[PDB]
Ligand binder design. Structure first.
Ligand SMILES: *C/C=C(C)/C=C/C=C(C)/C=C/C1=C(C)CCCC1(C)C
Length: 137
């Protein structure tokens, strides 16, 4: 469908656990967990072109991409990567990430807008998956 709008988080699973297995220090995890709970997500979708802004008190990021065209962003733990998004289905996109420098866990994310109007974001590092669900304001 159309993902454009302001999205508020209603459910999360395994966020701290994802950070923990990525090596994020416990004091920083507490800060990020509290920030993720209050995050604001703005999306502007224009066909295959996406602008996504994720805002919190400690971390704010803008992501710009077109499906099928490589772009640069960061992993969850802050490492620069090259990314490529593809449609897995009509409603779900998948992003594969490759570090610009060095080696690390295989990281990825997915975003799906359900028929319910729920936006489901998953973030993965190797075998560990975090899921966050949003609804449109
Ligand atoms: C398609 C939607 C995407 C790719 C959203 C990505 C959002 C993040 C990688 C958010 C990361 C955060 C942290 C790394 C700590 C602060 C809290 C968050 C959730 C904003």
């Amino acid at each position: 469908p159309n993902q454009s709008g302001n999205w508020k988080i209603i459910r999360s699973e395994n966020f701290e656990e994802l950070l923990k297995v990525l090596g994020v220090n416990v004091m920083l995890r507490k800060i990020y967990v509290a920030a993720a709970s209050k995050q604001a997500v703005e999306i502007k979708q224009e066909g295959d072109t996406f602008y996504i802004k994720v805002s919190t008190t400690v971390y704010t990021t803008e992501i710009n991409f077109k499906v099928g065209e490589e772009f640069e962003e960061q992993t969850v733990d802050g490492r620069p990567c090259k990314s490529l998004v593809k449609w897995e289905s009509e409603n779900k996109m998948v992003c594969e990430q490759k570090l610009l420098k060095g080696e690390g866990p295989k990281t990825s994310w997915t975003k799906e807008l359900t028929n319910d109007g729920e936006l489901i974001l998953t973030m993965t590092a190797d075998d560990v998956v975090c899921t966050q669900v949003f609804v449109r304001e």
